[PDB]
């Protein structure tokens, strides 16, 4: 529940205007902070096994997703100066690309790990 909440939280940065640079950077980096804090707390439960479980895989995919949102905004801010025609429809693409990719990830993960 908290990791999916943090991912949906990182999603909300797309609805902010692309001109308010401190706003979107602060949202993204604060989200990486909370995801980092949340990662270590969950991992303590089980021992220091060297293989991946279905729970550190989950938090790893969530951390890369938050990271992906932040670096995507980075490329957006880099590209708004070079060509606005490509950076105009980036947020409209992200608003539909991130939730669908996450729901498909959730679908494949939960089906593949509840079939076993």
């Amino acid at each position: 529940i908290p990791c999916t909440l943090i991912v949906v939280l990182s999603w909300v940065s797309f609805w902010i205007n692309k001109d308010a640079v401190p706003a979107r950077t602060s949202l993204g980096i604060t989200t990486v902070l909370t995801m980092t804090t949340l990662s270590t707390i969950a991992r303590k439960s089980l021992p220091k096994v060297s293989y991946v479980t279905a729970m550190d895989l989950f938090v790893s995919v969530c951390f890369i997703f938050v990271f992906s949102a932040l670096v995507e905004y980075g490329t957006l801010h880099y590209f708004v100066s070079s060509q606005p025609a490509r950076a105009a429809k980036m947020d409209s693409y992200a608003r539909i690309f991130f939730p669908t990719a996450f729901c498909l990830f959730n679908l494949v993960y939960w089906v593949s790990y509840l079939y076993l």
Binding site: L33, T36, T37, T40
Partner: protein, 52 residues
């Protein structure tokens, strides 16, 4: 970097030598520190001449 340093320091004994993970964390910390210091230096000379 500081929060991960604490969450790493809560696990090991107090050994005086530097471990490999300590060297890697210090290298990463120094790289982030140098990036921020580099931004400071490029923010200082920014007004005198914008080419630099």
């Amino acid at each position: 970097m500081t929060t991960i340093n604490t969450h790493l320091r809560e696990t090991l004994p107090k050994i005086p030598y530097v471990k490999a993970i300590d060297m890697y964390l210090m290298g990463c910390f120094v790289f982030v520190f140098m990036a921020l210091l580099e931004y400071a230096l490029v923010n200082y000379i920014f007004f005198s001449q914008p080419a630099r």
